[PDB]
Design a protein around this ligand. Structure first.
Ligand SMILES: Nc1nc2c(ncn2[C@@H]2O[C@H](COP(=O)(O)OP(=O)(O)O)[C@@H](O)[C@H]2O)c(=O)[nH]1
Ligand code: ALF
Ligand SMILES: [Mg+2]
Ligand SMILES: [Mg+2]
Ligand SMILES: [Mg+2]
Lengths: 133, 176, 132
């Protein structure tokens, strides 16, 4: 379990906000592996997101299945995932053992920065997830 | 505060029918959208998902029941807080019931959990079938020692559905 | 979708050639329900991990990633390359009703993996559709 409130909640949100600015993504979420939205932020320029609980259960079960495939093959883990459509994409990475960072971005976002700040955001959130164990 | 409830059981026992009846009766304001990853014959392939209010949030899942989908069924059990085991009443599905309960215990033991470790409620579903088996015979197969609440149901009609959910909710709460 | 007879023979040759041309360990065509329609292993490779398990997981993943795409207004995302330290997986659609999967290790060149996996998938898509 991982219950996020108080100062760690506030620090997680500040990470999500900073990541949105540095990357140009539309939505940033910290979700646990169980599928629960633990913190989310939306870029104020962006349209309303799709239902975020739908997004997060789909993303957590994608990550569940791909981690199981890895373990099937003898690996601890595959790398961060970038799902890329014609306009929309998703950057999904680990925020420690119990959670995932999710970035939703469109054509306006530079992929280099998504990956680059996405990875640092993942690492900052794993640090924060530990202080809420 | 977030709880996960998994509806478990053999193929076609009525797990998805449960979440759909619930979804159809809970008012707008107290539920999110139902997600289903299902084949065209609408058998569940990966999961159903139904978030609702009863702050505290309950995330209801179902698992695919086919014996050959154990790999995705067990991903869904991760972090479960409570389980509703939906048993079928049909005479020719009794051993399927036992196989599912055995499979349930095995998957739980991979996460280091015994059946004592997780609240469980048996729902004996499809009470409307003309040839339905006695409730106690179904129960004696999936729960020989009668350690678990049992509730009867006709999920296509709503009967027992909310009472099963309140029962497992009750147990998950009393567990904290 | 059920592959038998000459379409099955045709599928297996596409699978053998892709393994030869890529250096990959195993190659499968699976349906979107996670059933293995045809597969081949490289003679030099170890016994595979259980392939029915591998296939139910890939098809579950695909149903979830496909729902993510549609959620975002996309028809679909691109082919996947999952890379561990040594092992990897390539997955790509083979028409609307099937997926090609290659499992490979650090001796298989990623550019060949990607280049022949993509051609294998289009070839298998053709076999699949003409099987109906
Ligand atoms: N007669 C009867 N049929 C039911 C009942 N509950 C579900 N069904 C039917 O059983 C079939 C399988 O239901 P579903 O929830 O999809 O099964 P599952 O999701 O694999 O457990 C569907 O045709 C349902 O209408 C019930 O209580 N009585
Ligand atoms: F059709 Al099922 F679990 F057997 F959804
Ligand atoms: Mg179902
Ligand atoms: Mg036994
Ligand atoms: Mg072989």
């Amino acid at each position: 379990s991982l219950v996020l409130y108080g100062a760690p909640y506030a620090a997680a949100v500040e990470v999500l906000e900073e990541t949105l600015r540095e990357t140009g993504a539309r939505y940033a979420l910290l979700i646990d592996r169980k599928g629960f939205v633990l913190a989310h932020k939306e870029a104020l320029w962006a349209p309303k997101p799709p239902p975020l609980d739908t997004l997060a259960t789909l993303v957590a079960s994608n990550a569940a299945a791909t981690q199981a495939l890895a373990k099937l093959l003898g690996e601890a883990r595959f790398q961060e995932e970038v799902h890329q459509g014609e306009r929309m994409g998703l950057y999904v990475d680990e925020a420690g053992e119990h959670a995932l960072l999710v970035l939703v971005f469109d054509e306006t976002a530079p992929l280099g920065k998504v990956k680059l700040h996405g990875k640092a955001a993942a690492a900052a959130l794993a640090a924060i997830a530990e202080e809420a164990l | 505060i977030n709880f996960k409830i998994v509806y478990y059981g053999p193929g076609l026992s009525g797990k998805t029918t449960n979440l759909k009846w619930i979804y159809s009766k809970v008012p707008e304001g107290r539920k999110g959208e139902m997600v289903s990853l299902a084949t065209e014959d609408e058998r569940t392939l990966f999961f159903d998902f139904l978030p609702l209010d009863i702050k505290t949030r309950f995330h209801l899942y179902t698992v695919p029941g086919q014996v050959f989908y154990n790999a995705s069924r067990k991903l869904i059990l991760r972090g479960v807080d409570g389980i509703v085991f939906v048993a079928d009443s049909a005479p020719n599905r009794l051993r399927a019931n036992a196989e599912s309960m055995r499979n349930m215990r095995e998957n739980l033991a991979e996460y280091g959990l015994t059946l004592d470790d997780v609240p469980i409620v048996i729902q004996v579903n499809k009470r409307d079938l003309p040839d339905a088996l006695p409730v106690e015979m179904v129960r004696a197969v999936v729960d020989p020692e009668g350690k678990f609440p049992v509730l009867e149901a006709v999920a296509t009609e709503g009967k027992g559905v909310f009472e099963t959910l309140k029962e497992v909710s009750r147990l998950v709460l009393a567990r904290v």
